[PDB]
Amino acid sequence: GKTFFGQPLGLSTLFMTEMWERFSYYGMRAILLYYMWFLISTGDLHITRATAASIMAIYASMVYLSGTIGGFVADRIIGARPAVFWGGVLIMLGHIVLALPFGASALFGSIILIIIGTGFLKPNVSTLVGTLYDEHDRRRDAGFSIFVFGINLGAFIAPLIVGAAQEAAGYHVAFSLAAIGMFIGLLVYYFGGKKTLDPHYLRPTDPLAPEEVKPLLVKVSLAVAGFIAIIVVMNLVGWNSLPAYINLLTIVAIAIPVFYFAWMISSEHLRVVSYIPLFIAAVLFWAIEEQGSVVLATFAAERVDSSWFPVSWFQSLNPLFIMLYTPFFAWLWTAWKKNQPSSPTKFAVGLMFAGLSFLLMAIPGALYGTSGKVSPLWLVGSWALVILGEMLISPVGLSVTMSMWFLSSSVGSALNAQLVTLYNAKSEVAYFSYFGLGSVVLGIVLVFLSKRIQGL
Numbered sequence: 001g002k003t004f005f006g007q008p009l010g011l012s013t014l015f016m017t018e019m020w021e022r023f024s025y026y027g028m029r030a031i032l033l034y035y036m037w038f039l040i041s042t043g044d045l046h047i048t049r050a051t052a053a054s055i056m057a058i059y060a061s062m063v064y065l066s067g068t069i070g071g072f073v074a075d076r077i078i079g080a081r082p083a084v085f086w087g088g089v090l091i092m093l094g095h096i097v098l099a100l101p102f103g104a105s106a107l108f109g110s111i112i113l114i115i116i117g118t119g120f121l122k123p124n125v126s127t128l129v130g131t132l133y134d135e136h137d138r139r140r141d142a143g144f145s146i147f148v149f150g151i152n153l154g155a156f157i158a159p160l161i162v163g164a165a166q167e168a169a170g171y172h173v174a175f176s177l178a179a180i181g182m183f184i185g186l187l188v189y190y191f192g193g194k195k196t197l198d199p200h201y202l203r204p205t206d207p208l209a210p211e212e213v214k215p216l217l218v219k220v221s222l223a224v225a226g227f228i229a230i231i232v233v234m235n236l237v238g239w240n241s242l243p244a245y246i247n248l249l250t251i252v253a254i255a256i257p258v259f260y261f262a263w264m265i266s267s268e269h270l271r272v273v274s275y276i277p278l279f280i281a282a283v284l285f286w287a288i289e290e291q292g293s294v295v296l297a298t299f300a301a302e303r304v305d306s307s308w309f310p311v312s313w314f315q316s317l318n319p320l321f322i323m324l325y326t327p328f329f330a331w332l333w334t335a336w337k338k339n340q341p342s343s344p345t346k347f348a349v350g351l352m353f354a355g356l357s358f359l360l361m362a363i364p365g366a367l368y369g370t371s372g373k374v375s376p377l378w379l380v381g382s383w384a385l386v387i388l389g390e391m392l393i394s395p396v397g398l399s400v401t402m403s404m405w406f407l408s409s410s411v412g413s414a415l416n417a418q419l420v421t422l423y424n425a426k427s428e429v430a431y432f433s434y435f436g437l438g439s440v441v442l443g444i445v446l447v448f449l450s451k452r453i454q455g456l
């Protein structure tokens, strides 16, 4: 009888848990770059704005990378329900430390807490949604669609509420609101979950066997030791600026899939090779999409007349278009019975739309010059285009592909950590035109390659 939009009642709990976590996350993302600008302007943070942009990008990269690890830790060590709870606690702490009366000195600690916390929570709330359904339950896709609406809803309202709070009451109060958002999520999660969640998920479902503990320990220890060795050598040869560390994280984030690629190609060999263009297309798409909170956020603050509203509000456009497009594409893929495009073709076209979203942004500077301010509608059109691309590439991404798919966004963001340092008023038009055109061209290349990939 009683449901949450046709689904098991437990979905309401997880819906709200993620909505409020996404609220805390995207509330932070909407103001953190501006916060670093503020800390630079007061002389508390001694970096360039370019490096601040780089930080935003690599932050996102590590959050995504962390997400590829959290499922293992839940499934094999601590359980999905405690992963979500303690992940949320860590996330809340990460916002609290920025709410505290510190300055730049608290930034790194905040970032680490949220990287670890999001890694624990994000994959595992998704897992818990699955546990609501039997294997044979046809409602599963509908349920995840509803869950995703909650995600986007949280992403949508957070810049509005947290961004407004920031401009009125300051950054510390704004970060306190992010923390409170996660707290609300934890309250609903903790008390609601006890009502509907299977007790089974209080513990690992595939706990380490006795003989598995030592090898895992050796694996992790060697990884940490090597990473620390690299940092020691870096400091010895004088490569110890913040950009150097960001470069190290960039290399690590990119080396991970590259090593996977090199592994599989060495160790259906055709299939794996054919994924390379798809994986590259996904990386470049996520790169462009993830620049919304960095380069488009910069354009919004410097190049747009937003005198009458908080410029952080532009970050709401991304989840807004997702919500607006979704029922149309839901309809589209079911109504498109005859000659529906293949997944490789969807990637190509998706990459093209992302390219167009940047080519569009080259136009105001080319037409009006870069010294003035332009209509907010340029950014609206840009987000409209890139999200159109997301609708094509994202729903079939994991399908056509596993971890390397989830890694595509991490790698895209790591690429951004390098690229966004190139963006400024002098380079604006060339930046948008170059990377936009480059993306369209590779989209066109992928179209040429499409039939072969579809065959394999």
Ligand SMILES: CCCCCCC/C=C/CCCCCC(=O)OC[C@@H](O)CO
Pocket: 360, 375, 377, 378, 379, 380, 381, 382, 384, 385, 388
């Ligand atoms: C399924 C297709 C519909 C959804 C995607 C279409 C959205 C694309 C919009 C690109 C054009 C918008 C950019 C034009 C613009 O910014 O004009 C500014 C001007 O009006 C200043 O007053």
Ligand SMILES: CCCCCCC/C=C\CCCCCC(=O)OC[C@@H](O)CO
Pocket: 077, 078, 079, 082, 083, 086, 108, 109, 112, 113, 116, 202, 203
């Ligand atoms: C400034 C750097 C901060 C570093 C973060 C400190 C904490 C990092 C990792 C520990 C969190 C793991 C939480 C696991 C836990 O609470 O136990 C779960 C277990 O009891 C349920 O089976």
Ligand SMILES: CCCCCCC/C=C\CCCCCC(=O)OC[C@@H](O)CO
Pocket: 089, 096, 183, 186, 187, 190, 191
């Ligand atoms: C830097 C200072 C940090 C001090 C703040 C520490 C945060 C304190 C509490 C946050 C825990 C929220 C958990 C909400 C909840 O439902 O817990 C109830 C449950 O534990 C009852 O057994």
Ligand SMILES: CCCCCCC/C=C\CCCCCC(=O)OC[C@@H](O)CO
Pocket: 280, 283, 422, 423, 427, 430, 431, 434
């Ligand atoms: C895993 C896929 C990697 C593909 C990355 C594609 C782009 C990579 C590097 C391009 C950087 C060089 C272009 C620099 C540039 O021209 O900036 C434009 C503007 O600043 C002035 O022209």
Ligand SMILES: CCCCCCC/C=C\CCCCCC(=O)OC[C@@H](O)CO
Pocket: 349, 352, 353, 356, 359, 433, 434, 437, 440
């Ligand atoms: C399903 C149809 C949607 C696919 C998108 C179709 C895109 C078609 C053409 C894009 C035109 C790219 C033009 C490149 C350009 O104007 O760059 C010039 C600029 O670099 C001058 O330096």
Ligand SMILES: CCCCCCC/C=C\CCCCCC(=O)OC[C@H](O)CO
Pocket: 081, 082, 083, 085, 086, 089, 189, 190, 191, 192, 193, 194, 197, 202
């Ligand atoms: C240092 C910050 C404050 C720490 C909060 C401590 C909260 C008190 C006891 C910990 C409760 C552990 C709950 C773990 C858990 O799996 O919760 C899930 C719920 O059962 C619903 O799935």
Ligand SMILES: CCCCCCC/C=C\CCCCCC(=O)OC[C@H](O)CO
Pocket: 055, 058, 059, 062, 065, 066, 069, 104, 107, 108, 111, 112, 115, 242, 249
């Ligand atoms: C496999 C788990 C993922 C690994 C997480 C490692 C996270 C390490 C660094 C986070 C990247 C953030 C760098 C930005 C940064 O350090 O800013 C600090 C302040 O600017 C201090 O000057």
Ligand SMILES: CCCCCCC/C=C\CCCCCC(=O)OC[C@H](O)CO
Pocket: 096, 099, 100, 101, 170, 172, 173, 176, 179, 180, 183
């Ligand atoms: C159960 C513990 C967790 C409670 C939820 C997190 C609450 C976080 C902060 C509470 C409100 C803090 C007031 C804002 C603040 O820190 O001062 C604002 C600035 O200091 C003034 O510029």
Ligand SMILES: CCCCCCC/C=C\CCCCCC(=O)OC[C@H](O)CO
Pocket: 077, 207, 208, 209, 210, 211, 213, 216, 217, 220, 224
């Ligand atoms: C900065 C890296 C942090 C690494 C933390 C993960 C630790 C990795 C390996 C150690 C094993 C973790 C505990 C395993 C454990 O609880 O044993 C229980 C087994 O089920 C007993 O057979």
Ligand SMILES: CCCCCCC/C=C\CCCCCC(=O)OC[C@H](O)CO
Pocket: 213, 217, 220, 221, 224
């Ligand atoms: C960060 C550097 C990498 C080292 C990770 C720290 C290792 C943390 C814990 C390893 C402790 C050894 C695991 C044995 C264990 O606790 O299992 C207990 C089982 O329940 C057996 O009764």
Ligand SMILES: CCCCCCC/C=C\CCCCCC(=O)OC[C@H](O)CO
Pocket: 108, 112, 240, 241, 242, 245, 246, 249
């Ligand atoms: C549980 C802690 C694990 C730490 C995660 C890895 C963090 C290590 C390197 C990532 C980049 C951190 C360096 C950021 C930083 O503050 O460097 C500033 C230096 O003073 C350079 O001026």
Ligand SMILES: CCCCCCC/C=C\CCCCCC(=O)OC[C@H](O)CO
Pocket: 230, 234, 238, 239, 240, 241, 243, 244, 245, 247, 248, 251, 252, 255, 256, 259
């Ligand atoms: C899955 C295996 C992952 C292995 C990661 C490989 C990392 C090996 C070497 C990292 C190279 C060190 C980067 C340091 C760096 O680029 O500093 C340059 C700065 O611009 C100096 O000012």
Ligand SMILES: CCCCCCC/C=C\CCCCCC(=O)OC[C@H](O)CO
Pocket: 313, 314, 316, 317, 320, 375, 376, 377, 380
């Ligand atoms: C009424 C619009 C539909 C609901 C949007 C909720 C808020 C989402 C984004 C707000 C930030 C970007 C809006 C700026 C904007 O579009 O201004 C357009 C003006 O007509 C140009 O001056």
Ligand SMILES: CCCCCCC/C=C\CCCCCC(=O)OC[C@H](O)CO
Pocket: none
């Ligand atoms: C949706 C399918 C149709 C795609 C429409 C988007 C096509 C976009 C542009 C096609 C015309 C290219 C104009 C390029 C242009 O005028 O550049 C200006 C010069 O470079 C000025 O130096």
Ligand SMILES: CCCCCCC/C=C\CCCCCC(=O)OC[C@H](O)CO
Pocket: 363
């Ligand atoms: C397949 C979906 C693609 C949707 C295409 C619809 C958008 C059509 C044309 C977009 C061209 C954007 C440039 C507009 C422009 O430059 O005019 C300047 C403004 O009018 C300023 O007065």
Ligand SMILES: CCCCCCC/C=C\CCCCCC(=O)OC[C@H](O)CO
Pocket: 356, 357, 359, 360, 362, 363, 365, 366, 367, 429, 430, 433
């Ligand atoms: C389907 C319609 C989507 C709208 C996107 C169309 C954008 C296509 C071409 C616009 C590229 C504008 C490039 C401007 C440019 O680089 O030339 C200007 C010179 O550099 C002088 O500033």
